[PDB]
Design a protein around this ligand. Structure first.
Ligand code: JO4
Length: 282
């Protein structure tokens, strides 16, 4: 069924909440035993949002290899993503260790450091060129190289230096700054504009490690980003683009991280973003 007609059908019948609970019901459930270990309690921002054991990213250190992050592997689309929580004051060094060890090129941030008057994530990057950051636990240095502030997003080049080997890499930081404190955007154009910028940069291409994407919990806005990207890539690839079933792609993604798409508004917004993104793709 052409998703554009499925949309109108769901919209007219106002059954978004019903579709969504159906997804919640059939989603995968796998163990998350490492996340729940007592030694890792201060490495989870939210008690109810944990990575599955089978798909969790492991830090290349013997001490404690745990970070709240998951590898989402989309086999038909040939796209991989790491979804993670916003870093905590004690996990900023772990975050940049992961970026280094997975060879990622890009970091995608979908939240503001403060929202609804509370902190949603730490300041894990430097705000001035001459004030670099050093992470002593993971032996890394991070320098701001340039910043590019647009009305609804900011782009930054960063330099990550492995202090143990003095290798350096350019990392691109893509920061969507205008998602509203409550609800979802009215239109997907700026989100759509935002996704193509990430794509252009090379950050999603198989020549690099997987892109790192985060919001506060790493499941809601983050799930919307990778669901829209993968669905548009499949409509690109297949002989029959109308055979792309967004609900089925989402259930597939939920095999790798729990809770992706947090609200029936977010589900409806993911549809809108896809239908409007199809128009450019073909
Ligand atoms: O303290 C910080 O680092 C920080 C950075 C950027 C933020 O997003 C924006 C940027 C421009 C306009 C509206 C929001 C919010 C906090």
């Amino acid at each position: 069924m052409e998703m554009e007609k499925e949309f109108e059908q769901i919209d007219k019948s106002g059954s978004w909440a019903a579709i969504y609970q159906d997804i919640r019901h059939e989603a995968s459930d796998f163990p998350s035993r490492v996340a729940k270990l007592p030694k890792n309690k201060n490495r989870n921002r939210y008690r109810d949002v944990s990575p599955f054991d089978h798909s969790r990213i492991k830090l290349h250190q013997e001490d404690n290899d745990y970070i709240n992050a998951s590898l989402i592997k989309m086999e038909e689309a040939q796209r991989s993503y790491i979804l993670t929580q916003g870093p905590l004051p004690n996990t900023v060094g772990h975050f940049w260790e992961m970026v280094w060890e997975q060879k990622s090129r890009g970091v995608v941030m979908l939240n503001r450091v403060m929202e609804k008057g509370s902190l949603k994530c730490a300041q894990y990057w430097p705000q001035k060129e001459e004030k670099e950051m050093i992470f002593e636990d993971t032996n890394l240095k991070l320098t701001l190289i340039s910043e590019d502030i647009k009305s609804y997003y900011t782009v930054r080049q960063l330099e990550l230096e492995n202090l143990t080997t003095q290798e350096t890499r350019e990392i691109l930081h893509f920061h969507y700054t205008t998602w509203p404190d409550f609800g979802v955007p009215e239109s997907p154009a700026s989100f759509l504009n935002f996704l193509f910028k990430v794509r252009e940069s090379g950050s999603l291409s198989p020549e690099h490690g997987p892109v790192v994407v985060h919001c506060s919990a790493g499941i809601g806005r983050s799930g919307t980003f990778c669901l829209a990207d993968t669905c548009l890539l499949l409509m690109d690839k297949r002989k029959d683009p109308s055979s792309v079933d967004i609900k089925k792609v989402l259930l597939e993604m939920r095999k790798f991280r729990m809770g992706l798409i947090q609200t029936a508004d977010q589900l409806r917004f993911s549809y809108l973003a896809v239908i409007e993104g199809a128009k450019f793709i073909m």
